[PDB]
Amino acid sequence: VAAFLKNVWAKEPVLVASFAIAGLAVILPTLSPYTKYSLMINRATPYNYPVPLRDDGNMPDVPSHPQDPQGPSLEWLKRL
Amino acid sequence: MNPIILIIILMTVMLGTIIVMISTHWLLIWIGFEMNMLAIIPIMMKKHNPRATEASTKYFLTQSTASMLLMMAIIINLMFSGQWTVMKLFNPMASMLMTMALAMKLGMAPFHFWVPEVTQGIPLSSGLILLTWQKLAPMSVLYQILPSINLDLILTLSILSITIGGWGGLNQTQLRKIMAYSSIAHMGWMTAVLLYNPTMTLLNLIIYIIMTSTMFTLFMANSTTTTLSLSHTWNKAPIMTILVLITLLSMGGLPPLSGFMPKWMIIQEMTKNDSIILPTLMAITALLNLYFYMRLTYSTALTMFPSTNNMKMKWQFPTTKRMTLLPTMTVLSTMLLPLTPILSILE
Amino acid sequence: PFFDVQKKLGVDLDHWMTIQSAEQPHRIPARCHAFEKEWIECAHGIGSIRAEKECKIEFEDFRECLLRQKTMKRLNAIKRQRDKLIKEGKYTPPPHHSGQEDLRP
Amino acid sequence: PGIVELPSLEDLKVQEVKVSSSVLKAAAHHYGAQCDKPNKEFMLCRWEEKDPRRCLEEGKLVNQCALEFFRQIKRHCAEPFTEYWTCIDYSGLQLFRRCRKEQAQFDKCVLDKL
Amino acid sequence: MFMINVLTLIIPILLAVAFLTLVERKVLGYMQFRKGPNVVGPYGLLQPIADAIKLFIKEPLRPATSSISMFILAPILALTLALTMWIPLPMPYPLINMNLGVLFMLAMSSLAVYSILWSGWASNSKYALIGALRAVAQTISYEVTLAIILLSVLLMNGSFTLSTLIITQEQVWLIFPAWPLAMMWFISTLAETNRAPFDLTEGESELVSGFNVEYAAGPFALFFMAEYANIIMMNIFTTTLFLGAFHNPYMPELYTINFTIKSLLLSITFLWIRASYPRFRYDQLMHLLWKNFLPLTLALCMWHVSLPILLSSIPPQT
Amino acid sequence: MSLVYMNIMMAFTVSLTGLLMYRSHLMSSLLCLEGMMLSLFILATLMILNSHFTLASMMPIILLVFAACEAALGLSLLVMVSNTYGTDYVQNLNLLQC
Amino acid sequence: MWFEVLPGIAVMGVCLFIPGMATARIHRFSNGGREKRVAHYSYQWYLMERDRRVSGVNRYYVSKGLENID
Amino acid sequence: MMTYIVFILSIIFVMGFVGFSSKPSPIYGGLGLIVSGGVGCGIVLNFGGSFLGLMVFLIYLGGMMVVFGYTTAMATEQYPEVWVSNKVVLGTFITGLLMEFLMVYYVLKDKEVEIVFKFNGMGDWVIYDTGDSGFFSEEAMGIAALYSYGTWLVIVTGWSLLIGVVVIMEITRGN
Amino acid sequence: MNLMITLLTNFTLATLLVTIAFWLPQLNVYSEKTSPYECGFDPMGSARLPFSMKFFLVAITFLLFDLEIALLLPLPWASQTTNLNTMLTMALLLIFLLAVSLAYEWTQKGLEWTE
Numbered sequence A: 001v002a003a004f005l006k007n008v009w010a011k012e013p014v015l016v017a018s019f020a021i022a023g024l025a026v027i028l029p030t031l032s033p034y035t036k037y038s039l040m041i042n043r044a045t046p047y048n049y050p051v052p053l054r055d056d057g058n059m060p061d062v063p064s065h066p067q068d069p070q071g072p073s074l075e076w077l078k079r080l
Numbered sequence B: 001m002n003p004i005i006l007i008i009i010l011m012t013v014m015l016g017t018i019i020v021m022i023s024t025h026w027l028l029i030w031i032g033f034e035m036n037m038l039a040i041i042p043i044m045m046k047k048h049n050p051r052a053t054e055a056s057t058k059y060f061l062t063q064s065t066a067s068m069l070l071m072m073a074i075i076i077n078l079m080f081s082g083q084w085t086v087m088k089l090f091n092p093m094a095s096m097l098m099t100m101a102l103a104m105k106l107g108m109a110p111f112h113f114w115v116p117e118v119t120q121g122i123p124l125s126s127g128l129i130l131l132t133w134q135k136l137a138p139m140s141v142l143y144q145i146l147p148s149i150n151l152d153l154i155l156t157l158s159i160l161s162i163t164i165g166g167w168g169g170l171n172q173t174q175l176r177k178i179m180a181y182s183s184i185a186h187m188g189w190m191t192a193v194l195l196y197n198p199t200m201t202l203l204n205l206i207i208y209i210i211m212t213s214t215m216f217t218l219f220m221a222n223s224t225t226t227t228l229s230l231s232h233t234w235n236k237a238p239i240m241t242i243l244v245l246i247t248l249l250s251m252g253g254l255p256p257l258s259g260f261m262p263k264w265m266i267i268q269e270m271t272k273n274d275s276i277i278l279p280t281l282m283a284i285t286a287l288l289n290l291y292f293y294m295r296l297t298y299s300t301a302l303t304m305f306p307s308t309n310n311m312k313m314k315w316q317f318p319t320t321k322r323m324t325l326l327p328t329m330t331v332l333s334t335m336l337l338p339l340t341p342i343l344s345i346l347e
Numbered sequence C: 001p002f003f004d005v006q007k008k009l010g011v012d013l014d015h016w017m018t019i020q021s022a023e024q025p026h027r028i029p030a031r032c033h034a035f036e037k038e039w040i041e042c043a044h045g046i047g048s049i050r051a052e053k054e055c056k057i058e059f060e061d062f063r064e065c066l067l068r069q070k071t072m073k074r075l076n077a078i079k080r081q082r083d084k085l086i087k088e089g090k091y092t093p094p095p096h097h098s099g100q101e102d103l104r105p
Numbered sequence D: 001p002g003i004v005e006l007p008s009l010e011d012l013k014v015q016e017v018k019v020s021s022s023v024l025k026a027a028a029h030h031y032g033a034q035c036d037k038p039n040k041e042f043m044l045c046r047w048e049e050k051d052p053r054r055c056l057e058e059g060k061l062v063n064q065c066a067l068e069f070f071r072q073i074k075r076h077c078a079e080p081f082t083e084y085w086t087c088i089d090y091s092g093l094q095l096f097r098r099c100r101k102e103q104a105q106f107d108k109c110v111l112d113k114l
Numbered sequence E: 001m002f003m004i005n006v007l008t009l010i011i012p013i014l015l016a017v018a019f020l021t022l023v024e025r026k027v028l029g030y031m032q033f034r035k036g037p038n039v040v041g042p043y044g045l046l047q048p049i050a051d052a053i054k055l056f057i058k059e060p061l062r063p064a065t066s067s068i069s070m071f072i073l074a075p076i077l078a079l080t081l082a083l084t085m086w087i088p089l090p091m092p093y094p095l096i097n098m099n100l101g102v103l104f105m106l107a108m109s110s111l112a113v114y115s116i117l118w119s120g121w122a123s124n125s126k127y128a129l130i131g132a133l134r135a136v137a138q139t140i141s142y143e144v145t146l147a148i149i150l151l152s153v154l155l156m157n158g159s160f161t162l163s164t165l166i167i168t169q170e171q172v173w174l175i176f177p178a179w180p181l182a183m184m185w186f187i188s189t190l191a192e193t194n195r196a197p198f199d200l201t202e203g204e205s206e207l208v209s210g211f212n213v214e215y216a217a218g219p220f221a222l223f224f225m226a227e228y229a230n231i232i233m234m235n236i237f238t239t240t241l242f243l244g245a246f247h248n249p250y251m252p253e254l255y256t257i258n259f260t261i262k263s264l265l266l267s268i269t270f271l272w273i274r275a276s277y278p279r280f281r282y283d284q285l286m287h288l289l290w291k292n293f294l295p296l297t298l299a300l301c302m303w304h305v306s307l308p309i310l311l312s313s314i315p316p317q318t
Numbered sequence F: 001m002s003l004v005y006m007n008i009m010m011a012f013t014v015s016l017t018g019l020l021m022y023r024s025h026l027m028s029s030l031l032c033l034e035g036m037m038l039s040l041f042i043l044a045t046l047m048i049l050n051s052h053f054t055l056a057s058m059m060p061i062i063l064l065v066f067a068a069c070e071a072a073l074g075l076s077l078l079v080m081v082s083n084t085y086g087t088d089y090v091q092n093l094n095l096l097q098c
Numbered sequence G: 001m002w003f004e005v006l007p008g009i010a011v012m013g014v015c016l017f018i019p020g021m022a023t024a025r026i027h028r029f030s031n032g033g034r035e036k037r038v039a040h041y042s043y044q045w046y047l048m049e050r051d052r053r054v055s056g057v058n059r060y061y062v063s064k065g066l067e068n069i070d
Numbered sequence H: 001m002m003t004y005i006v007f008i009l010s011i012i013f014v015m016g017f018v019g020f021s022s023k024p025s026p027i028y029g030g031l032g033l034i035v036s037g038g039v040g041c042g043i044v045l046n047f048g049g050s051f052l053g054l055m056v057f058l059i060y061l062g063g064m065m066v067v068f069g070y071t072t073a074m075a076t077e078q079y080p081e082v083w084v085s086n087k088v089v090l091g092t093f094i095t096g097l098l099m100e101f102l103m104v105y106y107v108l109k110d111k112e113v114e115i116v117f118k119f120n121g122m123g124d125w126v127i128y129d130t131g132d133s134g135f136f137s138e139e140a141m142g143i144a145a146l147y148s149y150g151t152w153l154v155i156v157t158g159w160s161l162l163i164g165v166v167v168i169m170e171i172t173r174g175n
Numbered sequence I: 001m002n003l004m005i006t007l008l009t010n011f012t013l014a015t016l017l018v019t020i021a022f023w024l025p026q027l028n029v030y031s032e033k034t035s036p037y038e039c040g041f042d043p044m045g046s047a048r049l050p051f052s053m054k055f056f057l058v059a060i061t062f063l064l065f066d067l068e069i070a071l072l073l074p075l076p077w078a079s080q081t082t083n084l085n086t087m088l089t090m091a092l093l094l095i096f097l098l099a100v101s102l103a104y105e106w107t108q109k110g111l112e113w114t115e
């Protein structure tokens, strides 16, 4: 496959470069470690209003104040 | 034509028809119709002839007008209804525009002014693909919106279609114009019963598709596009004359052949609604269709026309053409009467 | 032959867009979300003929929400009356309508 | 068909937080921190009632608590807040990036004195 | 007071066009080992005034065979279209703050060819027809590349606004992560404005003057100023896109000085380019842009699609 | 409904009467077809923008897209006539009558 | 010699300096010393209309602070 | 007569549509439709559709620049008519302008015309919203969810455009 | 509104220059200055003869590629979406469809010229 690659690199290097960039752009995001970081970065953007919920008295996760430790934090993007 | 490109084109037109079949959105219906258009267009231009270009131009212009009318009907339905579900329409004018669009797409009269030239200017396989596969998607759309269909409009279009198809078929010597006007007559017979029982419409569509495909396969097998060559087929093979006689007797409407199966039961679903004079008038125009069918049968099979001396060479070579499922479709087009209640599988 | 393969294979192709009251990106309601919800939930599964014969009031309210034409007739009538009463000369606009009003915030 | 039932103009007559956009943006984080309870009550009852004719008392309490918070800001840390909202208001896009020193001074003052 | 701002935007760019003609002739002489125009004024400062007055006291000379409607409509539309896309340029604060100024630039750049087509067809001649056909082929060549260049460069910006383009320069120039796209964009700006070696419309050796060969003085000067405003504005746009400078909200003098100097240097580089290379054939124009440019920019477009996902560097849309 | 809706639909039927009555040129009819689609696109976009239907905003442009996907086909159905006839007059297009 | 082009091109620099600077200076006049409030979406427009409705002079650039309330 | 800006732009739209619906010549029809598309894009921009208006602008400019190239290539007559070089072109143009002014006078007088459906004489701004959509535009997330929500639509659109390319290649082969 | 004012001012400045260029100087026309230019000789026929233009497919496929651009253009806002995998996969799919059309053009001799 080396002779064929040398031949196409000698004839038209633009096609070889374009196909190399296309293959890199295809196979690298499937091997990327920061794609899930992009997922939570997009998911953590506060576009609309975070409306509260009614209380039946049984909820261990949601807080009553924004500064309470209960609830999700955003420390991972602050450090990164 | 490249075989891979032709296979891709056929997969495109079947994909467009399937998209029209399976979608619950008006935009996807129109997208499937556009794909159907754009894939059937090069099928007619397989031979690169001026007749094919004229037929393609006429077909493209008529179907484009139909597509724009369909889009205006869809937008009116959206604006008066606020959604896109393929169900009953919420405006009479949207129903008008969609009915005119589907009549233009089908070729129903008085929008029949494009079917005979389009069928004549294209080869036999392209005519088969047109007259069979283009009559499935608009029938599905009319099946979906039959609550909103105006009764007087569809009945007037149906009776005009049958009368105009019979009167057109009375005065054509070419085989393809005969096929086009017979298709208009079958279209009127099929769409007259749409509002009473759409299963009858589906059954008549299936039988018409089987019979028309059988006849176009026989014409492809004999390689004949004229009445005189069809008469000359008697010397090449007698079996071809026997099958053309029995098939063209079947599409006439004679018992005990299969072509009497749909049309008779059309009356069985129109006398229940106390419509008496309309099936009688459509039976009279079916007799007119039977008259030009009888003239064609007199031409081909019942009288052996004089031949030429060249055909002796054709006696030394068997027919090497590929007849795609010819005996099965001939049998289904001839002797399907004793299995009449099988239409209940279409419910 | 409406071959509904969207329910046979369980794949959602175009049910996410076909209705105004569907799931929207970033949870943005349309101008007639509640009327759409009422018209769907009242006319669900009972047939189109019974839906037209029985659920006509909520569909009429939805159509009035969308087209707003009865409100246009109301505004036209009051504006023609206002123009007439100015033209004969027994009406004077208040300072609030004329512009010098000092709005709430 | 039906009739509308609109509230009287006397009930809607309530004093307002007569401030600007940049002043509201400068003290936005501290207002959202200190005054979360009436704002969240108003947002919840507005979301679950979907009727502004029945959603007036919580809006009144939100307005009163906001004006009380701004009065508490005015009593203790007036001049750093004036500098903060002035340099915020100078920017066209109301960017929080171009106001780091003023924000640091404001948060230090309001943490040390309140 | 928007009228004063509009006038101060539209008149000094016409003066810049005139002095661009001055320095064009001077520098173009100077690499050809000769002096430029320096007789009329001190170092030839009065050459553009003489050129402007001379073209406006000649005879318009309308042809008999020319359809007068598009013949009189083409140059005014050309000058307006070269003038009307200056507004979304941040300078450091643009005239009109459009959120989609890139789309406005693209659409008004697509409209700019119509003056060339109408001037080619309005005058009844073979040379104008050939010039119109070559302009059509030039548009075919450059549009399908230029749109993808602008999209792929803009993918790190986050939005179509030109005002937020000055924010992205605050750390590093975008010519460093997109230098190949910078080369593609420079060749595309060479091709669009109809400057050599991509002129192909106002040819001297191939045609006589091409699309305006039948255009006498008065209407002819409008095409001249339209093309020169086009090249100055295109170089300003390239400067803003790739070599954006440091912006301080308390002193716009720094950014005005910096982008003025950078755009002036880029226009000097354009003058340097335009007279060192032979003219390309227009059959090799789409034997290059449709053959060599397009696959490379497709690869770089998909690379810039998949790159912020790779590095977790999704830009904000606001 | 409104006023601009009336203007746009009247433009559509005006362009329809333009298409449905030929004037001996195919490409002029193609221009009238694209005008009918322009009225359709404008009506659909205005209807959506009045009704705040965000998720259906794909449908106008895609509609527009598909129109070009047939309109070029009409252009591709022109030069073939020009590859057989000298011009593209529709009164010369009457070979299919026998 | 070569540097003789350096006068004339400098004039073009002034012709590339007069427009844009003027806009900035115009932005320092109609907006009362501040920049023009760049409105890009509905909420920025709502805040600018809030300033217009609270200023009482029907000018958005007249910004009132915490001294306005008692 | 100020807040009727949408009405005025629609009237210029109908005027240009009547102008190019006479079918005088492909270049002049393209000019008339381009004026019509410009004021239609102005309508869409005046209704907040920046992206849709600019997209229809760019698409129409490209498409009928191609149409200009085609009519200057093949479909050309020796003496093209502008608008008055032939009788029926001017006749149908004046006819269409007369009907246009006919319902203009009908809608500015009684404020309610009845052509198929009923139509009012007020501007469309009365139906436009009183609410604010925050830090974003809704059509932008429409064309953004085009890629995420719109799976089948984008697949069939791309396949149809690819099929259009292969069909247009196959048609003009000759042999 | 300001866009309309800028458009009107630009059109006013444009159409004022040609009016100055036309009605100010003295006109003197005969039946040779208005003649078409054919390098000093009479024109052979008229310029309205149909050009045997050779890049018709290139113009049509420019149109088709511009519609590919129209599909690919709202991509930046899709960068803010939540479902990133479908976004990336189908942006790559559409770019690959563009490349497939271009490669089929390359192989089947479409980018070259007729005659």
Ligand SMILES: CCCCCCCCCCCCCCCCCC(=O)OC[C@H](COP(=O)([O-])OCC[N+](C)(C)C)OC(=O)CCCCCCCCCCCCCCCCC
Binding pocket: A011, A012, A013, A014, A017, A020, A021, A024, E180, E182, E183, E185, E186, E187, E238, E242, E269, E273, E277, E288, E292, E293, E296
């Ligand atoms: C904008 C900022 C300033 C820009 C520079 C401005 C100053 C310099 C200007 C120079 C003169 C320009 C005008 C004259 C030339 C005009 C013609 C022209 O440009 O033709 C284009 C020429 C034409 O080539 P050609 O003319 O040689 O064509 C011959 C073709 N064959 C060999 C097949 C016979 O080049 C191209 O088309 C290539 C496009 C640009 C390539 C850029 C590559 C960047 C790096 C990619 C990756 C490399 C690493 C390897 C892969 C790694 C993968 C991980």
